[PDB]
Every structure is written in structure tokens, then in C-alpha cells.
Amino acid sequence: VLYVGSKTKEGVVHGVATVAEKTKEQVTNVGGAVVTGVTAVAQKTVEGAGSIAAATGFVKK
Amino acid sequence: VLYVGSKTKEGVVHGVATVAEKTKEQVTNVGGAVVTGVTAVAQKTVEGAGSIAAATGFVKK
Amino acid sequence: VLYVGSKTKEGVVHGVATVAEKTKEQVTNVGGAVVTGVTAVAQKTVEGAGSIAAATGFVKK
Amino acid sequence: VLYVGSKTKEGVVHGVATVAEKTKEQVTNVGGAVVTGVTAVAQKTVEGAGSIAAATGFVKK
Amino acid sequence: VLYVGSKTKEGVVHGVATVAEKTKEQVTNVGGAVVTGVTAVAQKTVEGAGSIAAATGFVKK
Amino acid sequence: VLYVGSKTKEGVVHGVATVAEKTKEQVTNVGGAVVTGVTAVAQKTVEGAGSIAAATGFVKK
Amino acid sequence: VLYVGSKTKEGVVHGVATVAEKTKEQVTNVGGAVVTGVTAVAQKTVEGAGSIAAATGFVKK
Amino acid sequence: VLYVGSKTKEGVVHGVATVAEKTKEQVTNVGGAVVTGVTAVAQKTVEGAGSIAAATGFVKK
Amino acid sequence: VLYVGSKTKEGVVHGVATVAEKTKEQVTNVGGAVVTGVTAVAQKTVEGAGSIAAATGFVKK
Amino acid sequence: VLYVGSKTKEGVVHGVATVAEKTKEQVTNVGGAVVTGVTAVAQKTVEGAGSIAAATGFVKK
Numbered sequence: 001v002l003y004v005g006s007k008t009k010e011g012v013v014h015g016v017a018t019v020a021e022k023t024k025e026q027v028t029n030v031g032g033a034v035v036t037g038v039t040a041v042a043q044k045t046v047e048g049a050g051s052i053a054a055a056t057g058f059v060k061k
Numbered sequence: 062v063l064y065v066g067s068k069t070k071e072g073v074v075h076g077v078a079t080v081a082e083k084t085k086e087q088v089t090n091v092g093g094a095v096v097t098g099v100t101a102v103a104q105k106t107v108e109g110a111g112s113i114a115a116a117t118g119f120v121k122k
Numbered sequence: 123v124l125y126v127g128s129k130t131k132e133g134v135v136h137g138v139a140t141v142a143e144k145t146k147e148q149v150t151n152v153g154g155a156v157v158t159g160v161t162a163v164a165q166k167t168v169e170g171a172g173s174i175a176a177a178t179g180f181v182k183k
Numbered sequence: 184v185l186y187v188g189s190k191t192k193e194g195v196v197h198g199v200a201t202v203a204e205k206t207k208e209q210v211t212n213v214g215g216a217v218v219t220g221v222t223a224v225a226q227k228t229v230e231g232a233g234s235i236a237a238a239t240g241f242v243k244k
Numbered sequence: 245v246l247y248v249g250s251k252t253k254e255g256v257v258h259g260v261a262t263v264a265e266k267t268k269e270q271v272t273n274v275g276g277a278v279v280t281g282v283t284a285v286a287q288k289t290v291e292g293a294g295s296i297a298a299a300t301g302f303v304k305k
Numbered sequence: 306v307l308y309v310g311s312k313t314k315e316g317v318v319h320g321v322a323t324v325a326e327k328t329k330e331q332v333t334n335v336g337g338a339v340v341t342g343v344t345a346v347a348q349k350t351v352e353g354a355g356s357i358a359a360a361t362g363f364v365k366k
Numbered sequence: 367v368l369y370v371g372s373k374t375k376e377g378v379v380h381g382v383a384t385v386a387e388k389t390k391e392q393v394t395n396v397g398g399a400v401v402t403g404v405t406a407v408a409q410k411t412v413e414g415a416g417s418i419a420a421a422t423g424f425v426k427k
Numbered sequence: 428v429l430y431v432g433s434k435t436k437e438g439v440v441h442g443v444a445t446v447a448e449k450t451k452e453q454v455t456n457v458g459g460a461v462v463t464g465v466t467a468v469a470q471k472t473v474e475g476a477g478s479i480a481a482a483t484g485f486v487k488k
Numbered sequence: 489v490l491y492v493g494s495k496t497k498e499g500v501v502h503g504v505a506t507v508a509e510k511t512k513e514q515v516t517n518v519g520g521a522v523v524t525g526v527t528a529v530a531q532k533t534v535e536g537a538g539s540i541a542a543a544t545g546f547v548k549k
Numbered sequence: 550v551l552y553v554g555s556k557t558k559e560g561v562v563h564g565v566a567t568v569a570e571k572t573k574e575q576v577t578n579v580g581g582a583v584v585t586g587v588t589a590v591a592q593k594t595v596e597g598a599g600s601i602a603a604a605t606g607f608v609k610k
Contacts, residue, residue: 002063009070011105017078017322018100024085032090036097042104049109052102055094057119062123069130072166076137078322078383079161083144093151096158103164110170113163116155118180123184131192133227138199139383139444140222145206154212159220171231174224177216179241185246193254194288200444200505201262201283208269215273218280225286232292235285238277240302261505263566307368315376316410323384323405330391337395340402347408354414357407360399362424373434377471381442384466389450398456403464415475418468421460423485429490437498438532445506445527452513459517462524469530476536479529482521484546490551498559499593506567506588513574520578530591537597540590543582545607
């Protein structure tokens with residue numbers, strides 16, 4: 001027997017509940033990067049890379 | 062027997078609850094990077110890299 | 123028998139509850155990096171790197 | 184028998200509850216790095232590195 | 245028998261509760277690094293490094 | 306001016322989040338009363354009565 | 367001016383978050399009363415009565 | 428001016444977070460009353476009565 | 489001026505966090521009353537009565 | 550001026566955090582009254598009575 005893999009869970013998200021009450025919100029940006037409100041995200045990668053909520057102002061070369 | 066893997070959990074998030082009440086919010090940015098409000102995120106990587114909530118103002122080369 | 127792995131948990135987050143009440147919030151940035159409000163995040167990496175809430179003002183080369 | 188691994192837990196976070204009440208908050212930044220409000224995060228790394236809440240003003244080379 | 249590993253716990257955090265009440269908070273930064281409010285974080289590393297709440301003003305080379 | 310009532314809140318419930326993970330549940334009853342799993346309920350009464358989660362085995366007269 | 371009432375809050379519940387993880391639960395009853403799992407409930411009463419989680423085995427008259 | 432009431436709070440519950448992890452639970456009853464797991468409940472009463480988590484085995488008359 | 493009431497708080501509960509980890513629990517009852525696990529409850533009463541976590545075995549008349 | 554009441558707090562509970570870890574618990578009862586685990590409860594009463602965690606075996610008349 002070579003039962004290498006079974007009943008496995010790799011990068012999983014599964015019981016999640018959120019509530020958000022706002023009166024105002026004023027996300028505002030100039031030449032930059034905003035990431036906001038990220039919830040319930042999963043992933044798996046082989047021989048690569050991973051990123052979920054990445055911001056970068058810029059990359060000047 | 063070579064039961065190498067079983068009933069495994071690698072990068073998992075599974076019982077989560079949040080509440081947010083705001084009257085105002087004024088995320089504001091100039092030439093930079095904002096990451097805000099990140100919740101319930103999982104992942105797995107082989108032979109790569111990982112990042113979840115990364116900010117970077119810029120990369121000038 | 124070579125029961126190498128079983129019932130394992132590597133990078134897991136699973137019972138979590140948060141409440142946030144604000145009247146104002148004024149995240150503000152100029153040329154920099156803000157990471158704010160990071161909750162319930164898990165991951166696993168082989169032969170790479172890991173980062174969860176990384177900020178960097180900039181990287182001038 | 185070579186029961187090398189079993190019922191293991193490596194980088195786990197699992198019973199957590201927080202409450203935050205604010206009237207104002209004024210995170211403010213200029214050319215720097217802010218990390219704020221980091222809760223309930225776990226991870227595992229092989230042959231790499233780890234970081235959870237890292238800030239860096241900048242890296243001038 | 246070679247029961248090398250079992251019922252192990254390496255880098256775990258699991259019963260935690262916090263409450264924070266503030267009227268104002270004025271995190272403020274110029275060219276530096278702020279890390280603030282870090283709670284309930286665990287991790288494991290093989291052949292690498294570890295860091296949880298690291299701040300660095302800058303690294304000029 | 307007789308500004309008797311304004312901007313009032315009488316019996317209100319408004320920011321609420323719950324998560325429940327079970328493998329089994331075996332509510333079982335014989336001749337009795339079970340109330341179970343009651344969440345997020347509000348009401349107002351004038352010149353009457355109120356009840357939310359009331360159980361009564363029986364009323365033999 | 368007779369500003370009798372304003373910006374009032376009478377019987378209110380408003381920022382609440384819960385998580386429950388169970389493997390088994392075996393609520394069981396014979397001729398009695400069970401109330402279980404009551405969360406986030408509010409109410410107001412004039413000239414009456416109030417009750418939220420009341421159990422009574424029986425009332426034999 | 429007769430500013431009798433203003434910005435009042437009478438019977439309020441508002442920032443609350445709980446986590447519960449169980450493997451088994453065996454609530455069991457015979458002819459009696461069980462109240463269990465009561466959280467985040469508020470109310471107001473005029474000229475009446477109040478009760479939140481009341482148990483009574485029975486009332487034989 | 490007759491500023492009789494203002495910015496008042498009467499029966500309030502507002503910053504609260506709890507964590508409970510159990511392996512078993514065996515609440516068991518015969519002809520009696522159990523109240524268990526009561527958290528974060530507030531109320532106000534005029535010209536009546538109040539009770540929060542009351543148990544009574546029985547009332548034989 | 551008749552500034553009779555202002556910025557008052559009557560029966561309030563507001564910054565509270567608890568953690569409980571148990572392996573077993575065996576609350577058990579016969580014909581009696583158990584109250585157990587009562588936390589974070591407030592109330593106000595006019596011209597009535599108050600009780601929070603009252604137990605009574607029985608009242609035979």
C-alpha cells in the first residue's frame with residue numbers, strides 16, 4: 001500500500017461570518033495602491049508563488 | 062504500509078466571526094500603499110513564496 | 123509500517139471572534155506603507171518564505 | 184513501526200476572541216511603515232523564513 | 245517501534261481573550277516604523293528564521 | 306415645543322455575527338419542551354407581556 | 367421647550383460576535399424544559415412583563 | 428427648558444465577543460429545567476417585572 | 489433650566505470577551521434547576537422586579 | 550439651573566475578559582438548584598428588587 005494522500009485539506013477556509021455597518025467611508029488615493037475589505041480567500045500553489053492582498057505604490061525602473 | 066499522508070490540514074482557517082461598526086472612515090493615500098481589513102485567508106505553497114497582506118510604498122531602481 | 127504523517131495540523135487558525143466599534147478612523151499616508159486590521163490568516167510554505175502583515179516604506183536602489 | 188509523525192500541531196492558533204471600541208483613531212504616516220491591528224495568524228515554514236508583523240521604514244542602497 | 249513523534253505541539257497559541265477601550269489613539273510616524281496591537285500569533289520554522297513583531301527604522305547601505 | 310420623542314431606539318438588535326460548527330447534534334425530547342439556537346431577536350410591547358425563548362414542560366390543570 | 371425624550375436607547379444589543387465548535391452535543395429531556403444557546407436578544411415592555419430565557423418543568427394545579 | 432431626557436442608555440449591551448470549543452456536551456434532564464448558554468441580552472421594563480435566565484423545576488399547587 | 493437627565497447609563501454592559509475550551513461537560517439534572525453559562529446581560533426595571541440568573545428547584549404549595 | 554442628573558452611571562460593567570480551560574466538568578443535580586458560570590451582568594431597579602445569581606433548593610409551603 002502507498003496511501004500517499006488522503007482526506008487532505010491544503011489552503012482551505014470554510015466557516016466565516018462578518019457584519020459591517022458604516023455611515024461614511026472615503027477611500028481616497030493619489031498615485032498609490034489601496035487594498036481594502038478582503039475576506040474568505042484560499043489558494044494553493046505548486047512551484048510558483050502566492051499572494052493574497054498585496055499593495056504596491058509603484059515600481060520605477 | 063506507507064501511510065505517508067492522511068487527515069492532514071496545512072494552511073486552514075475555519076471558524077471565524079467578526080463585526081465592525083464605524084461612523085466614518087477616511088482611508089487616504091498619496092504615492093503609497095494601504096492594505097486594510099483583511100480577514101479569513103489561508104494558503105499553501107510548495108517551492109515558491111507566500112504573502113498575505115503585504116504593502117510596499119514603491120521600489121525605485 | 124511507515125506511518126510518516128497523520129492527523130497533522132500545520133499552519134491552522136480555527137476558532138476566532140472579534141468585534142470592533144469605532145466612531146472615526148482616519149488612516150492617512152504619504153509615500154509610506156500602512157497595513158491595518160489583519161485577522162484570521164494561516165499558511166504553509168515549503169522551500170520558500172512566508173510573510174503575513176509586512177509593510178515597507180520603500181526600497182530605493 | 185516507524186510512527187514518525189502523528190496528531191501533531193505546528194504553528195496553530197485556535198481559541199481567540201477580541202473586542203475593540205474606539206471613538207477616534209488617526210493612524211498617520213509619512214514615508215514610513217505602519218502595521219496595526221494584527222490578530223489570529225499562524226504559519227509554518229520549511230527551509231525558508233517566517234515573518235508575521237514586520238515593518239520597515241525603507242531600505243536605501 | 246520508532247514512535248519518533250506524537251501528540252506534539254510546536255509553536256501553538258490557543259486560549260486567549262482581550263478587551264481594549266480607547267477614546268483616542270494617535271499613532272503618528274515620520275520616516276520610521278510602528279508595529280502596534282499584535283495578538284495571538286504562532287509559527288514554526290525549519291532551517292530558516294523567525295520573527296513576529298519586528299520594526300526597523302531603515303537600513304541605509 | 307413638546308419634542309416628546311425623537312431618535313429613539315426601543316428593543317433593537319443590530320450588529321451580530323455567529324458561526325457554529327458541529328459534527329453531531331441529537332436534540333431529543335419526550336413529553337417536554339426544547340428551545341435551542343435563538344439569535345438576534347427584538348421586540349416592544351405596550352400594555353401586554355413579552356417573552357422570547359420560553360419553554361414549559363406542560364401545564365396540567 | 368419640553369425636550370422630554372431624545373437620542374435614547376432602551377433595551378438595545380448591538381455589537382456581538384460568537385463562535386462555537388462542538389464535536390457532539392446530546393441535549394436530552396424527559397418531561398422537562400431545556401433552553402439552550404440564546405444570544406443577542408433585546409426588548410422593551412410597558413405595563414406588562416418581560417422574560418428572555420425562561421424554563422419551567424411544569425405547572426401542576 | 429425641561430430637558431428631562433437625553434442621550435440615555437437604559438438596559439444596553441454592546442461590545443461582546445465569545446468563543447466556545449467543546450468536544451462533547453451532554454445536557455440531560457428529567458422533570459427539571461435547564462437554561463444554558465445565554466449571552467448578550469438586554470431589556471427594559473416599566474411597571475412590570477424582568478427576568479433573563481430563569482429556571483424552575485416546577486410549581487405544584 | 490431643568491436638565492433632569494442626560495448622558496446617563498443605567499444597567500449597561502459593554503466591553504466583554506470570553507473564551508471557553510472544554511473536552512467534556514455533563515450537565516445533568518433530576519427534578520431540579522440548572523442555570524449555566526450566563527454572560528453579558530443588562531436590564532432596567534421601574535416599579536417591578538429584576539432577576540438575571542435565578543434557579544429554583546420547585547415551589548410546592 | 551436644576552442640573553439634577555448628568556453623565557451618570559448606575560449599574561454598569563464595562564471592561565472584562567475571562568479565559569476558562571477545563572478537561573472535564575460534571576455539574577450534577579438532584580432536586581436542587583445550580584447556578585454556575587455567571588459573568589458580566591448589570592442592572593438597575595426602581596421600587597422593586599434585584600437579584601443576579603440566586604439559587605434556591607425549593608420552597609415547600
